[PDB]
Design a protein around this ligand. Structure first.
Ligand SMILES: CC(=O)NCCc1c[nH]c2ccc(F)cc12
Length: 162
């Protein structure tokens, strides 16, 4: 079983009338839920407007994220995997890595809007790193939890870029 942390979706922006049961019935459309909680005040029991769900598998998390936007009990909510940005730094690509290497690999994580292969300001030579900007943060979130990224035969360092 994948680590539980990687099977969780944290759901912001809930309707205050959403319950454990209604949040569960909604997100069970995209997989088996082993846990589903609406956060509430300990004294008033009034919703805090957010919660989380835990799927049985990471593929189920993916399915839920691919089904965004989610309207739950009449309100569009904001699910996120376990710093919300749309851009990554990709290091270690050396001088022989081109746009199409980066595109063919990273397009399978999300929709790419910008690829920027970095060159030396003085010489024009490639510096061996790049930035990739996507249309949505979940691509980056999937990317940076991987232990490894292999592109053009290179083991790359990938992190969020601000
Ligand atoms: C952004 C924020 O502060 N809350 C959402 C993320 C989060 C952190 N710890 C939790 C515990 C329970 C839960 F339902 C959600 C969370």
């Amino acid at each position: 079983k994948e680590p539980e942390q990687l099977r969780k979706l944290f759901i912001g922006g809930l309707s205050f009338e959403t319950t454990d049961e209604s949040l569960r019935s909604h997100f069970e459309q995209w997989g088996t839920l082993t846990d589903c909680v609406v956060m509430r005040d300990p004294n008033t029991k009034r919703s805090r407007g957010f919660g989380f769900v835990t799927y049985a598998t990471v593929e189920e998390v993916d399915a839920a994220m691919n089904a965004r936007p989610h309207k739950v009990d009449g309100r569009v909510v904001e699910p996120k995997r376990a710093l919300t940005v749309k851009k990554i730094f990709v290091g270690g690509i050396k001088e022989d890595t081109e746009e199409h290497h980066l595109r063919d690999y990273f397009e399978q994580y999300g929709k790419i809007e910008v690829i920027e292969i970095m060159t030396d300001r003085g010489s024009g030579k490639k510096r061996g790193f790049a930035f990739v900007t996507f249309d949505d943060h979940d691509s980056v979130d999937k990317i940076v939890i991987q232990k490894y990224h292999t592109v053009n035969g290179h083991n790359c360092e990938v992190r969020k870029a601000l």
